[PDB]
């Protein structure tokens, strides 16, 4: 969503479900904005 950063470790996608943009985490990352490394 523009050049103002939202998701950390992932791709941004619109959740028409909750009507707010969500983050699609890449492997080994968790969180609402994919901000954490999952050490497990």
């Amino acid at each position: 969503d523009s050049h103002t950063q939202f998701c950390f470790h992932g791709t941004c996608r619109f959740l028409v479900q909750e009507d707010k943009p969500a983050c699609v985490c890449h492997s080994g990352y968790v969180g609402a904005r994919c901000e954490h490394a999952d050490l497990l």
Partner: antibody, heavy 118, light 113 residues
Framework: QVQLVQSGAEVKKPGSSVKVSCKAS????????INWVRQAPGQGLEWMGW????????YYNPKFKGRVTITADKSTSTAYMELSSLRSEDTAVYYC???????????WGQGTTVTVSS | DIVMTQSPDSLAVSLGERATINCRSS???????????LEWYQQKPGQPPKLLIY???NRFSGVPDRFSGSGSGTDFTLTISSLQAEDVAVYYC?????????FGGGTKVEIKR
């Protein structure tokens, strides 16, 4: 204005389960994590897990072996903490704390005393 | 999984004297953005913890200037310049960089007499 309000004390027999509640007010509920911390007597602090209520997301402390369950009521701005198969070791003050993305535990609930006894 | 280790354990410091609490992470706790989500909390009996320091060195709004945090990737310290009667509590470091989140063991500060 930001308040985290927990339910009252519990006495639960060994083996049973306990649901602790947390009413959150003064901010948008889908915009912060609701964390859970516990503290057994004389003992230090133990993070249990977290919940993002928006597009619902959880992460728990593995040391609990999936006994802890964190739910969120969008309608009533409450996040629940359910802990199953209660042991004497689970006797503690259960806390909930607010955390914004990569921000600290600025807000805390008063605590909930759960006593596990026969 | 990260192991936060508080070095002092129990600290007895006279009034107005300097108090230093040490904490250590087993693995690096530097976030991908280059920030380190290490925080200090103060807890008094029959009370929920209070935020003191966040992001290693940032003093939370309303915290007296006597409180200050500092660190280096795995080693971190909480400092009280001049101990006050009010500062007698248990201090916890916290790691919120990586999941799972980790609390330290805690350090009791008492008045040395």
């Amino acid at each position: 204005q930001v308040q985290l309000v927990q339910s009252g004390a519990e006495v639960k027999k060994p083996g049973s389960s306990v649901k602790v509640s947390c009413k959150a007010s003064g901010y948008t509920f889908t915009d912060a994590y609701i964390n859970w911390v516990r503290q057994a007597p004389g003992q230090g602090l133990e993070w249990m897990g977290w919940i993002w209520p928006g597009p619902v997301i959880t992460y728990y402390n593995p040391k609990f072996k999936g006994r802890v369950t964190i739910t969120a009521d969008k309608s009533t701005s409450t996040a629940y903490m359910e802990l199953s198969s209660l042991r004497s070791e689970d006797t503690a003050v259960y806390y909930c704390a607010r955390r914004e993305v990569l921000s600290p535990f600025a807000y805390w609930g008063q605590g909930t005393t759960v006593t596990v006894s026969s | 999984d990260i192991v936060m280790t508080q070095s002092p354990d129990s600290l007895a410091v006279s009034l107005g004297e300097r108090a230093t609490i040490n904490c250590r992470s087993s693995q690096s706790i530097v976030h991908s953005t280059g920030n380190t989500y290490l925080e200090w909390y103060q807890q008094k009996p029959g009370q929920p913890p209070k935020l003191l320091i966040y992001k290693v060195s940032n003093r939370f709004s309303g915290v007296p200037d006597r409180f200050s945090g500092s660190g280096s990737g795995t080693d971190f310290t909480l400092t009280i310049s001049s101990l006050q009667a009010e500062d007698v509590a248990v201090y916890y470091c916290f790691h919120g960089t990586h999941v799972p989140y980790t609390f330290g063991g805690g350090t009791k500060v008492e008045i040395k007499r």
